[PDB]
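Hi U.,

Before I forget, here's the chain from the pilot set. I'm dumping it here mostly so it's searchable later in email.
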Amino acid sequence: MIEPSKITVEQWLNRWLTDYAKPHLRQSTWESYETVLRLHVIPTLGSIPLKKLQPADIQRLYASKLESGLSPTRVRYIHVVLHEAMSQARESGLLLQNPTEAAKPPRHPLEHHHHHH
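Structure:
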């Protein structure tokens, strides 16, 4: 038997966390960036491979969860944290392009990686 779906977003996420959640020295930031991310994107698009993840799905995530009663500003935050988190896979050479860049998301610049110890 071949185990279905071996490389997904959440597959990278849990592994990336296992490595990059180790103590580092730059800004004692909260776990908020992790919580909102995993809570929203994992049960939605996380079970999809990054090379198959469509920009439409990312757009749909923002829109459908807005319909779900999420505040525009907090969805706006989810937008950028998802962007720059996924960009780490881009710079990891496992992702050819950020699907976020081809999507139609709310306009907001990146506050950038506020990490954690």
